[PDB]
From a paper:
ICV, however, has only one major surface glycoprotein, the hemagglutinin-esterase-fusion (HEF) protein, which possesses all-in-one of receptor binding, receptor destroying and membrane fusion activities. To further evaluate the infectivity and transmissibility of IDV, we expressed and purified the ectodomain of D/OK HEF, and determined that it also uses 9-O-Acetyl-Sia as its receptor by glycan microarray. We also solved the crystal structure of D/OK HEF, both in its native state (resolution of 2.4 Å) and in complex with its receptor analogue (resolution of 3.1 Å), and the structure of the enzymatically inactive HEF (resolution of 2.4 Å) alone and in complex with two receptor analogs respectively (both resolutions of 2.2 Å). Indeed, our results show that IDV HEF is functionally and structurally similar to ICV HEF, but with some distinct characteristics.
To avoid the enzymatic cleavage of the receptor substrates, we generated the catalytic mutant for the binding experiments and for the structures of the relevant complexes. Thus, we designed the enzymatically inactive HEF protein (HEF-mut) containing S57A, D356A and H359A substitutions, and expressed it using the same method as wild type protein. For the IDV HEF-mut/receptor complex structures, interpretable electron density is observed for all the three glycan rings of 9-O-Ac-3'SleC, including Neu5,9Ac2 (9-O-Ac-Sia-1), galactose-2 (Gal-2), and N-acetylglucosamine-3 (GlcNAc-3); while for 9-O-Ac-3'SLN, electron density for the first two sugars is well defined. The glycan rings of 9-O-Ac-3'SleC go through the open channel between the 230-helix and 270-loop. The open channel in the receptor-binding cavity of IDV could provide a structural basis for accommodating different receptors with diverse glycan rings in different cell types, which should be tested in the future. But the majority of the interactions between ligands and IDV HEF are made by the 9-O-Ac-Sia-1 moiety, whereas the glycan portion of the ligands do not make significant contacts with IDV HEF, except for a hydrogen bond between the Gal-2 of 9-O-Ac-3'SLN and S173. Compared with the ICV HEF receptor complex, the 9-O-Ac-Sia-1 of the receptor bound to IDV HEF displays a very similar orientation. The 9-O-acetyl group of the receptor docks into a nonpolar, hydrophobic pocket, formed by V275, F229, F240 and F297. The absence of two hydrogen-bonding interactions between hydroxyl group of Y127 and the 8-hydroxyl and 9-amide of the ligand, pushes the 9-O-acetyl moiety of 9-O-Ac-sia-1 to the other side by ~1.1 Å.
Author numbering:
A (entry chain A), D (entry chain A), F (entry chain A): 3 to 193, 197 to 429
B (entry chain B), C (entry chain B), E (entry chain B): 9 to 157
Write the structure that this text describes.
């Protein structure tokens, strides 16, 4: 008698091919899968990142931790002071808090800005501070993108030529003036007969500041905006001008009406505009209309040793106050910037404006020891190489790829029977 | 027809591993049973399936570093990278399937070998998973000893 | 020497699959035929060769997306990319060759198994593709029944 | 008796190695091969491309389809009008057809330009229109490279300061003038005694035009070229100048002889030069010599949402007319531009200059539903990953790689024998 | 237990290939020797190990062209490229190990086959690397002829 | 009796897994390894590289080969002359050797510079020649990075407007002057009463020079530096200026004190500064203070057909002379530049300053027929794809990757036993 083990399959079995042997099975299981994506901020390296912020990340606030959007351990990684903002420290308006932001970190989190919003009501002849705000943070984010560190430079070496010029003040600016730019004026120019002499100045952007190397500086090269040569001649003789030159003499900024058309709004009166520019370290010249001279007195110092795309966190008030979205728009138009945004209003635990449940959820990733990828879609762990939907850029780290679930191969499971040769 | 072949069956009828016997009266007429105590095969399948985790973990742990500053998705590039990774996963799959196949087939050979040495040398191998038994000095309790059904 | 070995021959002399027989008078002197009706092998080879198309189509369908705005060929980079793809094709080749080898060898085992059950158990296996037959109750029409040459 | 299947090989058999088993065979067959390359234009995505053209792709021409270099279905994808060209619409010379080119497509085909060649004989004080043509299309192709869409902007908002200045005309320009730039002149300046005042103007490049977003504008900032200050003083007092400034006052174009040497050709008389520049949206200033003011009045609007390398098709007349190769040279020096060129003369089916057999062969790819790669060498289907010779850049899509035929591995075929173990 | 199985031993005790024998008096009690003249196995292992050089040389000869003008190491990118190459080397390794395994196992089968035809058909195969011998017309010089220990 | 081959393993055996069969073994051997890295200079393609040098690579030197840091075959690949340097040929100071460096090679080796170090004691009103040296080689290396070839252009077409101006000389410059720039002066300007007219000039950067295509030119746009407008008025009326304009009139260099502050060092007297700039071919204008005009008269011509990162070799004297490290610092701050530096002093075999054992070791790679990768860490052969430590950039060729030795997989060796199935 011939006795045999017999191998047989059903219509329920499908054949899976192999390099060196096939397999019949009824069930299959996918070989791998998608990695969850979590919205909000995080870091891939806990020992090389830095945060810059305000009360909402300030562990020294009287109401900590209720006033905080991050736990203690994350707050220790921030450089923050209640009431502060990068922009407030750039200009230093009268009576505002003036924090010296500085630090180093390849990954960077910017979570401030709200402390100079329209709610602040800072005037000082500002044409449109929201516009200035957007321009300013754009330059910061651009420079931060390629820098390892950042520091406020709280005082530039400056020198003016006039010996009669005195420090300028205005009732629109709390009856004084910004820390930067400085405002120098000669009391005598008077378009009667007295017309004074063209004013001159230099300012130096240092090659370093403390322990921080400077390869690049963000500065504002402000100019006044008058209604028209005539309204201007209410104050100065001839045409208004305030020109900025590098050491060789190339014009780099300012407003020279003598070639450029006037662009002021009717009967608004005098306005000041402060575009920000990225300049190399060095000494720079200024030439201006005799009566009024503006001189940059601060900067932010960056290096070019490199960094990762940055994270910028929405910085807005609760509903009752007047906010802006200038840092959002700064971030959107600047390459290498990732923006973190709430979907619900800011409702603080401490008071109205500090300690928000959603923001705490969004910032909790800052947070983790196992984040491998950070993107404009959120952050991921190192589970699999795939995600269900694209991780939107900017992004960095070990970042997953989108593939259709159907393109993920399967493996036989359940009852299994081998097959090889042609069996015929 | 004995471990070198897989046969198909229609309608209902269980798939899997069965005992099959042949001639007798001249000429006989076949017979195929309804399962044995192939407990080894079940456990072996379990072990072999769990052993695939090693190859999958190797693949899952490999994620390319990237850095993009750009604000708009480079979709065609993203898709190409995925397609390449899916291709690699496809090779690994084909390797794993053959690895299961070959190691199961070998586990089946080791089952059949234990049966050969169990009635040895009453058994007499006729290729893997098949035996010729002399019905004259192996009765029925003999056959049930050797094959256990 | 029976399906575990491949031998070489010189000058003319056909390569391939043949029937070979041994002793007889004590001591015998060998003999190797001139083909059988190994029709299965021919058809199997055909099927196995056609089955390689699946692995080749997988490879041919994979072409990386690219975008170059540059006006002069980046030759070194182009060559490196090609070299990498040729390397991958080389692995796939080695996989395909072994896959053919293993599945042909198995088809050969399945041929030999049919011969064993054809004269069973007159045949008696001596490793794959070899048998011991008792020339006393298998004459010549018996042997020609079992092996067909 | 021992009876065995015996396996044997000849000197004609070669051994092919495998991972898990070798194979003897007499024949081999290559595993894969090269994909044919077809010369001419094509697209990888039929639902995201656009063509810009002239009579040769205009389905409304009286002689269609005999006057066409493409079939109906492709012509429907073009924005074309008989007698038109991008350059003609840029300047709008008297009596020429003035088509408003506009559309969107990641892949772009430029097949026009011939309608303003030397054959046209447009004068209008042109120094060298062929030079202008080359400069103009260079800017177009550069901007088109990174844009999804393009549109003519057929009228810029402009404003001049003079109240006495009137519209300028010349017998060299059909006794009128271009649509762009505008020519403004004061009849009184007369170097007797009358010398007038410096002229001023502004022109605005919009942030959008219809449904089209503008991130960039191609414009011409023209200036006149006089023989020498003296020949100039035939017309104006002092030195000629026509300067272009952005909103802040930075010089961006024009000709200021007061610092720059004169560069006119002897006794040729006055010439006009019109270099094209790529400018951001905004408002721009002009200052010029009192008698003659030039003001840009048109532009081409592009976005920066991205696009593929473009295809530019040779746009020349049949042998009897006077052609140029300015769009060829524009394309060659501009990154991301692919040029399509005939090897035989243009011989039209409709008339001499429309409906060419070779061009129809070259444009037929526009055409196909199965093109996966487009390159400066031609286009390919998705047959294999290899080509016999390099696909020259620019190129995009699933593009084949060059490899030597000898580096393509083979597979055993014909009679085959397996081998494993050492067999010894 | 005969070429389909590998057994473990404790403390001292040599690992490797040995001759093992079974019953005798009813019931017997086993015995495992202390090496044979398995000279084939030693030489085969040598050949198989040297044959791996082909696959390694293929890998070693493949180095991607690169060009970097940058002054500071892009470390994360460098590490990712290495990690990818190490992954490929890992697949090749797994291929090579199985290739050795399968070709050694086959060389072992070819050894056992020579032993079968050496005492044929006194030997009688009981799965690969095992035989049933009738102690009645194979004495001891017979067994030592066939198995050589 | 049952007789069996029995397979058994020890605690000394470890199991190695395979796709299709496992292997027991006692020993393992690593599958591959690291490729040695050799410090110094080399090339990946012997038929496409060029060297530029001095006596130390000059096969025509009287003391060759004792005065050489390379063997004959490598010296034949250099363009060198004893006593020469790129910088010396740029300016052509009185009595210095003036070699016309020119050649083509995708790989480039710069091994000269030492012949104009502080040891040379060239004065010629130089503010800081070491500074000039660093600026000059920076421009060279930058341009060389993307060029296939380089040539000195030993004479620019120049034209000055003044008919009274004469060639300038000074006792600080061997009682003559540089070849470049040219110095033109009018004897009459005298701030008594005589004040002369603004000087003018043009210089042309050619589109080619001999067989060499020029896409880019390195030139110096020099200007004088006076102590203060007053010390300046020792010489000229009004403010000093020397301005450089392109053909359209855009300022591109010079020193215009009229807007820029003075930057001279007290009582040092007049100094000359010569920053180098990369300019396109064309004709350029100069406007200057009446008394003194400087005009560029030489350049280095480069193309933009592409090249590899360059190698710059430390070019310093033996200890007894006064050296500088300007070419080192030029190379470090310039992308695509690889610097080769000795660790011991230069001790020459011929004399003190030519034929150094260490430099010969470092340059011997130039040298080899089997270098596949060149990097800031040294060069490698094509042994394996790995190195023990990173190859620092810049780098090019088939360059090895760093991996930990532990991540290199092993293969079983020694006594080996196969395993398959579950064996249970
Ligand atoms: C009060 C005065 O002198 N002039 C009126 C002036 O018109 C008077 C007509 N005389 N004439 N001819 O017209 C302007 C607009 O019509 C008025 O602003 C001006 O009155 C201003 O009153 C405001 C309060 O609303 C201020 O007091 C301003 O005076 C200051 C100031 O802004 O506080 C006094 C500051 O000390 C002075 N400081 C400096 C450094 O200049 C400041 C400043 O000059 C002006 O604002 C100039 O503004 C700029 C930046 O151009 O004015 C009175 O001008
Ligand atoms: C006719 C005239 O007024 N002047 C002669 C002028 O020399 C005469 C000497 N008098 N003085 N002293 O010299 C120039 C060159 O020697 C001649 O071109 C000019 O005669 C021109 O005749 C041509 C025909 O060949 C034209 O008629 C031109 O007159 C126009 C024109 O070009 O059509 C008349 C236009 O109305 C006028 N339009 C405007 C808006 O200015 C146009 C134009 O001024 C001039 O071409 C200026 O050209 C530019 C752009 O600078 O001239 C007569 O000039
Ligand atoms: C000698 C002379 O004319 N002037 C003194 C001049 O002060 C004299 C006061 N008179 N007043 N009024 O002051 C300067 C600094 O106090 C002295 O340099 C100058 O004396 C110089 O003597 C030096 C030697 O130390 C030179 O001879 C220099 O004369 C030359 C020169 O440098 O060789 C003569 C050259 O021919 C002349 N060449 C040209 C083309 O100008 C050269 C040159 O002008 C000046 O150096 C100007 O330098 C520049 C580039 O601005 O001077 C005497 O000046
Ligand atoms: C083909 O064979 C398989 C198993 O031989 C059958 O699978 C069983 O089906 C029932 C209900 O579907 C399950 O409860 C059992 O668990 C399955 N078997 C196993 C191995 O677990 C299958 O139903 C058969 N198909 C047909 C068409 O009859
Ligand atoms: C080695 O063997 C093969 C086949 O055994 C021989 O191949 C045959 O050769 C003739 C003419 O070359 C062909 O017409 C046949 O079709 C081939 N056989 C097959 C399998 O199709 C080959 O000629 C032999 N070589 C030598 C050296 O004798
Ligand atoms: C798998 O191992 C086998 C056996 O070691 C290799 O077969 C050898 O291949 C070369 C050709 O490269 C022949 O010259 C040798 O004679 C073969 N040896 C034997 C014993 O047949 C085979 O190359 C390996 N597979 C791969 C793809 O590397
Ligand atoms: C396990 O078995 C192996 C070999 O069967 C033993 O290896 C031998 O050990 C000695 C000294 O260590 C060497 O001189 C021999 O060369 C080794 N054998 C071989 C194959 O060359 C090993 O010692 C055993 N281990 C234990 C724990 O006893
Ligand atoms: C192929 O499958 C076999 C069997 O499932 C795997 O062998 C196992 O390997 C691990 C080591 O990774 C051992 O610890 C297990 O005991 C092995 N199981 C058996 C039954 O031997 C093998 O890993 C797989 N091959 C690869 C390369 O993944
Ligand atoms: C062993 O490998 C090398 C290749 O590294 C080969 O050249 C040599 O001939 C091989 N030895 C044998 C006996 O095959």
């Amino acid at each position: 008698e011939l006795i045999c083990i017999v191998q047989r399959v059903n219509e329920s079995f499908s054949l899976h091919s192999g390099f060196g042997g096939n397999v019949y099975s009824m069930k299959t299981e996918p070989m791998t899968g998608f990695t969850n994506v979590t919205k909000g901020a995080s870091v891939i390296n806990q020992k090389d990142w830095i945060g810059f912020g305000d009360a909402r990340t300030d562990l020294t606030n009287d109401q900590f931790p209720a006033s905080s959007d991050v736990p203690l351990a994350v707050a220790k990684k921030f450089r923050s002071l209640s009431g502060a903002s990068l922009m407030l420290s750039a200009f230093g308006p009268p009576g505002k808090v003036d924090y010296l932001y500085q630090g180093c970190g390849k990954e960077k989190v910017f979570y401030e800005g709200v402390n100079w919003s329209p709610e602040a009501g800072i005037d000082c002849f500002g044409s449109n501070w929201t516009q200035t705000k957007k321009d300013f943070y754009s330059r910061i984010y651009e420079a931060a993108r390629s820098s390892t560190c950042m520091t406020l430079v709280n005082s530039l070496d400056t020198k003016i030529s006039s010996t009669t010029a005195t420090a300028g003040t205005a009732s629109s600016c709390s009856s004084s003036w910004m820390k930067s730019p400085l405002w120098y004026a000669e009391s005598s120019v008077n378009p009667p007969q007295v017309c004074g002499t063209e004013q001159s100045a230099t300012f130096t952007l240092p090659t370093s500041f403390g322990i921080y190397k400077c390869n690049k500086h963000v500065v504002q090269l402000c100019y006044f905006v008058y209604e028209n040569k005539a309204k201007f001649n209410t104050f100065g003789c001839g045409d208004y001008y305030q020109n900025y030159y590098d050491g060789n003499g190339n014009l780099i900024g300012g407003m020279d009406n003598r070639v450029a058309a006037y662009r002021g709004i009717a009967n608004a009166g005098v306005k000041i505009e402060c575009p920000s520019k990225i300049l190399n370290p060095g000494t720079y010249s200024i030439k201006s209309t005799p009566r009024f001279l503006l001189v940059p007195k601060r900067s932010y110092c960056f290096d070019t040793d490199g960094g990762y795309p940055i994270q910028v966190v929405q910085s807005e008030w609760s509903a009752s106050r007047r906010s802006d979205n200038a840092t959002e728009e700064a971030c959107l138009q600047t390459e290498g910037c990732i923006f973190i945004k709430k979907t619900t209003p800011y409702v603080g635990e401490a008071a109205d404006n500090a300690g928000d449940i959603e923001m705490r959820q969004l910032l909790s990733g800052l947070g983790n020891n196992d984040t491998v990828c950070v993107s404009q879609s959120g952050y991921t762990k190192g589970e699999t190489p795939f995600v269900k939907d694209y991780l939107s850029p900017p992004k960095y780290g070990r970042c997953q790829l989108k593939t259709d679930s159907g393109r993920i191969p399967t493996l036989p499971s359940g009852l299994i029977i081998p097959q090889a040769g042609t069996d015929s | 027809f004995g471990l070198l072949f897989v046969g198909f069956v229609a309608g209902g009828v269980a798939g899997g591993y069965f005992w099959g016997r042949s001639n007798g009266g001249g000429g006989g007429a076949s017979v195929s049973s309804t399962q044995a105590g192939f407990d080894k095969i079940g456990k072996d399948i379990q072990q072999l399936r769990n052993d695939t985790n090693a190859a999958i973990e190797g693949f899952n742990g490999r994620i390319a570093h990237d850095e993009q500053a750009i604000k708009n998705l480079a979709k065609e590039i993203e898709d190409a990278r995925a397609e390449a990774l899916v291709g690699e996963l496809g090779i690994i799959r084909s390797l794993i399937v053959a690895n299961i196949s070959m190691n199961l087939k070998e586990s089946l050979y080791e089952l059949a070998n234990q049966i050969t040495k169990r009635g040895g040398g009453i058994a007499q191998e006729a290729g893997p998973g098949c035996w010729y038994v002399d019905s004259e000095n192996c009765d029925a309790s003999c056959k049930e000893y050797i094959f256990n059904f």
